[PDB]
């Protein structure tokens, strides 16, 4: 979907067009709403129906009993809901697909070789630390509120 | 050996390879990354820019 344009007008008469995926539509406006007694698939289905998108998600997901969307875009709320349940979203054409983040989820495999059609390969490794990164990164690591009060 | 064909349909007009297309970019992302496109065309007098 076209979202921006640029043009140099006098000598290099060149126009640059920029387009983004349909998830940019869900990231358009901030919302405040509440959901109760709905599974992940149902919530995603309602959100996609609000924009005319299609849904592709095999697993129903867990049942969310009470949560509020507070000053968040629909894409941001979907990101939070899928991340907290171990899911991830992807967009192709018009349809948004939600899948499980598992070590064996890539159904088809494609193998390349360095000796052929490869121009540059840079492999890097780093040590985990809570000093860098975001709060979500250290949440995904061992850091978490293990102790809570009902 | 590459024999590329690139056709872009925007609004109601098409840009073909060898006509006005100068450069083209891509992105096919998963979760953190999205899908985006950035392509540059030659716009004599900026007509399409208009």
């Amino acid at each position: 979907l076209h979202t921006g344009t640029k043009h140099n007008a006098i000598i290099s008469d060149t126009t640059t067009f920029t387009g983004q995926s349909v998830n940019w539509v869900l990231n358009r406006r901030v919302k405040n709403t509440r959901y109760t007694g709905v599974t992940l698939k149902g919530l995603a289905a309602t959100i996609t129906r609000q924009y005319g998108l299609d849904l592709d998600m095999s697993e129903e997901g867990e049942m969310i009993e009470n949560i509020s969307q507070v000053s968040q875009t629909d894409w941001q709320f979907l990101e939070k809901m899928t991340a907290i349940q171990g899911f991830g979203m992807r967009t192709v054409g018009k349809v948004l697909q939600i899948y499980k983040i598992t070590v064996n989820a890539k159904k088809l495999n494609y193998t390349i070789s360095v000796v052929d059609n490869v121009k540059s390969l840079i492999v890097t490794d780093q040590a985990q630390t809570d000093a860098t990164g975001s709060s979500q990164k250290i949440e995904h690591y061992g850091g978490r509120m293990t102790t809570v009060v009902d | 050996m590459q024999d590329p064909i690139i056709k872009i349909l925007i609004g109601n007009d098409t840009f073909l390879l060898g006509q006005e297309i100068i450069d083209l970019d891509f992105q096919i992302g998963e979760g953190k990354k999205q899908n985006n496109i950035n392509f540059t065309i030659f716009d004599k007098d900026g007509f399409f820019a208009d």
């Binding site: 921006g4 983004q20 995926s21 894409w75 | 992302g29 979760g31 953190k32 990354k33 999205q34 950035n38």
Partner: peptide, 24 residues
């Protein structure tokens, strides 16, 4: 020198626009 300082600045700006529109 200043020509290239400006070029580099513009490169950085457009590189950042890349990133802005690279992330969901």
């Amino acid at each position: 020198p200043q020509a290239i300082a400006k070029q580099i600045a513009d490169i950085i700006n457009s590189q950042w626009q890349g990133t802005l529109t690279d992330y969901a």
